[PDB]
């Protein structure tokens, strides 16, 4: 919203200047985005009278002779100009904003052009350039420089909040800083009405959209120019003077939080009738366009006879055909209260966002109509010598708004604060709250305007933002916590750790979108995506993710393609969506490897990843294994899942050549698993001050058997002293029954309490070397040294 | 094709000493209450570990602590505020003489927890070490009350053994405390009190110490209208209850099979 | 925050749509409504209300979502770190004191804290923050906050 | 005695007062998640293992130790390190070790130190023969961990 200073202030006549100002509404609750001085005007120039106007023969140009102290011409291709206005006459040598370039006398078809008249534009005081500035023929006495009636501005742009609608009306602004203390100035309506009937009627056939609706009757109109301090108020208010009534009805909308439209009453008919649009019907609306109207919107229109035809969108924009010209004499006030929610559709609906529905839609005062009648026609009485009837048309009966219990200790103790009950129930009345009782409960009912205040709360808030947040001391508060809140910050801990311990292995976290590319799904070989975007940002981005390892391979080309890393090892914890939200930990392995930078032996692909995983459970204190399974996604011969403490919880292999392929991408190893890993509770084992047994044997198989089934049953058979159990090396071929490899085994033994007699080793190595005939396993060396 | 089930490079996986585990927890457990982590020097001035705290020579107090003594020049024992201070050498008998270097250091209200090894010239059994540590607290501000103390003992004590636990006080001893006292926490899994540590209120002669240390070195009296609360707990003595530990000979006995056993533990 | 309210609009909503998808309430049991990708993290403090008891402090750290135009110091995709301390006899002035803690923990010393009344419709009072950057020598708006809106009391309970 | 708990603003010169304790504490735990295994070492030293391992004399000494193998404050860190190594070797027989310690030190002043140490056959494929080992792999692994702390590692002999 704009905040003008100066209109303002002609209500808290006490401002100490716009800077002051911006403070005092700041701790009010609106902030200003922004303070600008808007008015410089040069003395070339001057108010001047249009005596008359001359059309150039065979020009659309017109010569205007000019009462400027001296006579002078001028030439305009201005529609609007025409004898009998006033108009802002920049003299020649002035120096004008929208030129740059300075003003002069010069021939223009003929005529010697003594400087010219101005639009809002060149003056520089709207964006309006379509069009001469219209002033009154008597405004000024003729040659008086424009700023002795036109002094610059400071335009304050405030933010005001959904909740303060009323402070969507400079006056209600003004009741806020009266609150503070400053003295408030509200405008007379000094109204001579006459008790004689309004020549229409009033027919609200949709109360429900228009709960309040009251109708003014003016006529005996004299519609010409609004007076300078008018045009120069709307302006700086981010509006563009029209005319009399019109400007009457923006300038008591900007003061009071109060759409109103006159309707010419050449077009209004028998009367005005309220009511929902008939599907079909048809309303060039005041902005020049021609539209649609849906039987959802609320609409004015009038009737003659048996035919009833649109006036306006209620609430949002009037219609081009009644808006209030030169020759109206009489209209028709609208003031009235819509329903919110229907205009905030129609509003929607067709792409308007007016002064009028923006208002509406956070509300107006269920019951400031009939003073704003007063005001709006009082103004037209003054500005326009209209002729106003005594009586209203009105329809609805709004009721007021109730009490509210207020307990100045609740005020204190909610707050932190002590202010005294009396500087509390003072501040509640200035805000115009009537105030019963004695405590320590109070009836507070507040003024119809302050929609935002229905709770004892809501008023709290009141004595807070008057006394100033910044009273409200500071303090920390003591308590123990209840019991169901201990230990609640466990789960977020530990997967903090989780993230800190890969980081320290050596791990690169990466953060990625949320979201999803469907085509992926058939990219990566993946099921479907279950969630999707009824608006996304973009159709790559229409679905959220079932993987993380997607998004890493993708960040991996993306850095290959803008910098060029030989290597990579990256992991990224985030969520994930498919039947249930869960959390998922991927990583991503990448390049060469580990070595020596000026050797060659390296250390990389599966085995380097699977390495580094083991590392990290081994870190973890939990059971690491990955045994080979399939995956769409996977290399087939790079391929496997992953056995946490046992149970599965995700896999790790080789993306799948073909998909390397389409993305154009070296083998790219990596996994995914599902998050809370397991918790593997301590269960100290007090080690042995005795020596261990030592015992190497090679256990013969086929190629194709996993090392993990042999492991497993090597231990599993090993007997319960079995210490340790490590391949130290994996061998196949000659003298083996090829299709055949031996594994080596290092085997350590150990008893708690005291040492082992060769007989239960040499013994528990047959046990061993028994089951592992009896599964049909070879042993290329027993009892080997 | 590759056997996935085959182990892969053998990068080392470290690990975390119990006694860092344990110290970790407890000072988690108290920053969550306002608590903040700081050090002292583990050899010491007979002046910051025996006099300031109220502990002269001679006196029966004294012997509460087996004190093992230093000797040799050339070493420089710095102060609370950087200079360099003397005394007879000695390594500190517990992590209390912090208490008055943090407080001729800073001014109140705060709140401390200092972790530390601390010596103690005594025979080395399976629940007795020469060379343990202790982790004291200092909560010192006006208004500080005695049943602050107890708040935090509570609070420690549901942190560490759940919502059945409960704290108990006892009046005991202390030449740096008064009111003095030791507490134990209820112990629902093993079903029985274990003794934690000792507390109280500062010491009026605490504070009288620590002030005139500070006139000597310049500073204005801080401590002359503010109370306070101290602890001080032994670490192993829990680590040991907590992990399931048999042998306090353990902590410092340097073998991996023992230390390898805490990877896991957070 | 109801529907076609002008307050709703503080919050540019992605909406969800597909079926099979489980989501779970506070107290672990499957609840309904329409999905949506949280706008900020808020809805957080009235899932743990439900399912805990008065006193407590909690912070809540979370990716929240808007349907907004990516620009250099604007994201559709960002982090919020929401703040609750609920128990009897909670004022505002523990609020205040908790952002003046905050702010000397982050910026020194030389820091300090401002509030202004702002609008939020589950707080009342409510307000905006900003803490003084010395380094910068500038007022950073940080956050909203104030004291928990009465309604929001009730739904839990309701619920 | 009723139970508690304080509020108050701590005062001004509190503050960050536990940043030094919480640095150390993230290179233990940076050091646990590279890879090595922390290590308790007594304080103490063996007057001649300063001889034994080639060092200055301890500067500061026992008037009355547990025993003359503990009767002086260790200078160094690494040889208790070495020991423990020998010890281990004795017990069990680990085929590797990546140890480190962090702990006081005491000579002119009494300071912090950091210690690793590093023995056996190497990382490499527990089946396979290649391998990585000794010097440049201590001197790597110690490149990652100033590569973790963002600071310049640099080994000149
Ligand atoms: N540090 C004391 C224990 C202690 C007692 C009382 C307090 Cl207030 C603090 C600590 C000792 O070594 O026995
Ligand atoms: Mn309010």
């Given at each position: ?8 202030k ?6 100490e200047?716009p ?5 005092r509404?700041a ?13 410089p ?15 150039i023969?065979?020009?659309?140009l017109?010569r205007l002779?000019?009462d ?6 001028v ?20 120096e ?5 370039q300075?003003?002069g ?6 005529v010697?052009?003594?400087g010219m ?15 001469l500035?219209?002033f009154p023929?008597?405004?000024?006495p ?6 002795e ?28 800083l ?7 100035v ?6 001579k009405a006459?008790?004689?009937?309004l020549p229409?009627?009033?027919?609200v ?10 109708l ?7 519609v010409?120019p ?8 709307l302006f ?13 009805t923006?300038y ?14 050449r077009?209004?008919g028998?009367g005005?009738?309220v009511?929902?649009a008939?599907?079909?019907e ?9 539209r649609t ?6 609409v004015?229109?009038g ?15 009037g ?6 010209r ?14 919110p929610?229907?205009?905030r559709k129609?509003?929607?609906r067709?792409?308007?966002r007016?002064?009028?529905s ?6 107006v005062?269920?019951?400031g109509?009939?003073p ?9 009485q003054?500005?326009?010598?209209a ?9 609805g ?5 109730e009490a509210?219990?207020?307990?100045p200790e ?22 115009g709250?009537?105030?019963?009782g004695?405590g ?8 119809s ?6 709770l ?9 933002r008057?006394?100033?947040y910044e009273?409200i001391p ?8 209840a019991?169901?809140n ?12 989780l993230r ?6 050596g791990?690169?976290?990466v953060?990625?979108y949320?979201f999803?590319?469907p ?10 995506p ?8 973009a ?8 993987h ?9 080309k993306?850095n290959?393609?803008?910098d060029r890393?030989?290597?990579?090892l ?13 959390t998922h ?16 032996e ?5 085995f380097?990843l699977?390495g580094?995983?083991?590392a ?7 059971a690491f294994r990955?045994?080979?399974?399939a ?9 496997g ?9 995700g896999?790790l292999?080789?993306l ?6 389409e ?6 190893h990596?996994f995914?698993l ?17 020596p ?18 042999v ?8 007997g ?17 029954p ?9 085997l350590?033994?150990?008893?708690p ?5 060769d007989?239960?080793?040499?013994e ?21 040294p | 094709?590759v ?9 080392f ?24 982590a700081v ?6 001035s007979?002046?910051?570990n ?16 087996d004190?093992?003594?230093l ?9 609370p505020?950087?200079?360099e201070?003397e ?6 008998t ?12 800073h001014?109140?209200?705060f709140?401390?927890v ?7 010239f005594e025979?080395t ?6 060379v ?8 010192v501000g ?8 107890k ?6 004590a549901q ?5 059945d ?6 009046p ?7 009111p ?6 209820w112990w ?5 009190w274990?003794?934690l540590?000792?507390?109280g209120?500062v ?12 006139e ?11 109370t ?6 032994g670490?192993?003595?829990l680590?040991m209850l907590?992990?399931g ?5 353990y ?5 991996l ?7 896991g533990?957070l």
């Open positions: 919203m704009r905040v003008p200073f100066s209109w303002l002609a209500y808290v006549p006490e401002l200047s800077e002051v100002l911006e403070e509404l701790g009010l609750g609106f902030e200003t985005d922004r303070i600008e001085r808007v008015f005007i040069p003395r070339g120039v001057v108010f001047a009278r249009v005596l008359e106007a001359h059309p023969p065979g020009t659309r017109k002779v000019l400027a102290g001296r006579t002078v011409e030439v305009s291709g201005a529609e609007n100009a025409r004898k009998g206005i006033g108009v802002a006459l920049a003299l020649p040598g002035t004008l904003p929208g030129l740059g300075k003003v006398e010069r021939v223009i078809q003929g010697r052009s003594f008249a101005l639009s809002p534009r060149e003056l520089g005081v709207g964006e309006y350039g379509g069009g500035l219209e023929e008597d405004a000024l003729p040659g008086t420089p424009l700023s009636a036109w002094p610059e501005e400071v335009v304050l742009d405030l933010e005001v909040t959904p909740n303060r609608p009323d402070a969507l009306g400079l006056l209600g602004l003004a009741r806020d009266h609150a503070l203390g400053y003295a408030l509200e405008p007379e309506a000094a109204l006459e008790a004689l009937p229409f009627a009033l027919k056939e949709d109360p429900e959209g228009a709960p309040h609706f009251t003014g009757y003016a006529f005996g109109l004299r010409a609004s007076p300078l301090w008018m045009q120069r108020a700086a208010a981010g509006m563009r003077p029209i005319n009399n009534v019109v400007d009457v923006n008591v909308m900007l003061e009071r939080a109060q759409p109103m439209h006159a309707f010419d009453l077009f209004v028998e005005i009738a009511r929902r008939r599907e079909g048809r309303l060039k609306t005041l902005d020049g366009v021609e109207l849906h039987p959802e919107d609320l004015i229109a009737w003659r006879g048996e035919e009833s035809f649109p006036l306006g969108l209620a609430g949002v924009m219609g081009a055909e009644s808006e209030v030169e020759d109206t004499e009489a209209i028709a006030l609208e003031v009235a209260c819509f329903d929610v229907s205009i129609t509003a929607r067709h792409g308007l007016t002064e009028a923006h208002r509406f839609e956070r509300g005062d269920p019951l109509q009939v704003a009648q007063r005001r709006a026609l009082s103004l037209l003054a500005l326009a010598g002729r106003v009837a005594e009586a209203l048309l009105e329809a009966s709004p009721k007021p708004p509210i219990p207020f307990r609740y005020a204190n103790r909610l707050l932190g604060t002590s202010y005294p009950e009396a500087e509390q129930i003072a501040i509640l009345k200035r805000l709250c009537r105030v019963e004695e320590p409960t109070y009836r507070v009912t507040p003024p305007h302050r929609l935002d205040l229905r004892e709360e809501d008023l709290v808030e009141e004595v807070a008057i006394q100033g009273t500071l303090a920390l508060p003591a308590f123990f916590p019991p169901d201990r230990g609640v910050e466990a789960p977020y801990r530990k997967e903090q750790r800190e311990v890969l980081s320290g292995l791990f690169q976290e953060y990625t949320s999803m590319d085509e992926d799904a058939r990219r990566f070989r993946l099921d479907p279950r969630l999707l975007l009824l608006n996304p940002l159709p790559e981005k229409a679905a959220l993710r079932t993380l390892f997607p998004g890493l391979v993708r960040v991996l993306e290959l393609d803008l890393p030989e290597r990579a990256l992991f990224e914890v985030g969520r994930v969506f498919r039947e249930r939200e869960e930990l991927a990583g991503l392995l990448f390049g060469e490897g580990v070595g020596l930078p000026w050797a060659k390296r250390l990389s692909g599966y380097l699977k580094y995983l083991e990290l459970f081994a870190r973890l204190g939990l990955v045994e080979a399974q995956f769409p996604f996977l290399h087939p011969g790079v391929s899942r992953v056995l946490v403490e046992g149970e599965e919880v896999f292999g080789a799948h050549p073909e998909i390397a392929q993305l154009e991408l070296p083998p790219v990596l995914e599902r998050l809370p890993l397991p918790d593997k509770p301590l269960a100290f084992q007090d080690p042995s001050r005795h261990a047994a030592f015992r190497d044997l090679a256990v013969v198989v086929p190629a194709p058997t996993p090392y993990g089934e492991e497993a049953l090597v231990r599993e058979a090993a319960p002293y079995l210490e340790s159990l490590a391949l130290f090396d994996l061998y196949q071929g000659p003298p083996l090829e299709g055949h490899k031996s594994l080596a085994f290092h350590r033994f150990r008893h309490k005291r040492t082992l007699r007989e239960e080793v040499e528990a190595v047959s046990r061993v070397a028994e089951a592992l005939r009896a599964r049909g396993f070879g042993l290329r060396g027993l009892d080997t | 094709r056997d996935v089930s085959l182990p892969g490079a053998s990068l996986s470290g690990g975390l000493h119990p006694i860092t585990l344990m110290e970790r927890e407890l000072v988690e457990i108290f920053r969550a209450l306002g608590y903040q050090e002292g020097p583990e050899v010491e007979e002046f910051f025996f006099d300031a705290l109220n502990i002269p020579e001679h006196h029966p107090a004294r012997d509460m602590w004190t093992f003594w000797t040799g020049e050339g070493f420089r024992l710095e102060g505020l950087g200079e201070v005394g007879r050498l000695l390594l500190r517990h992590t209390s003489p912090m208490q008055v270097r943090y407080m001729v250091a001014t109140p209200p709140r401390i200092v972790p530390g090894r601390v010596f103690r025979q059994d399976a629940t007795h070490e020469a343990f540590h202790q982790l004291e607290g200092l909560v006006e208004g500080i009350a005695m049943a602050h103390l708040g935090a003992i509570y609070e420690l942190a560490l053994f759940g919502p636990s409960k704290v108990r006080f006892q005991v001893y202390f030449p740096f405390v008064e003095g006292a030791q507490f134990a926490v629902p899994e093993g079903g029985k274990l003794e540590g000792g507390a209120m010491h009026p002669k605490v504070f009288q110490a620590v002030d005139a240390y500070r000597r070195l310049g500073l204005p009296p801080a401590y002359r209208g503010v306070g609360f101290a602890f001080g707990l670490v192993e003595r680590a907590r992990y530990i048999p042998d306090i000979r902590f410092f006995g340097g073998r099979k023992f230390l390898e056993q805490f990877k533990v």
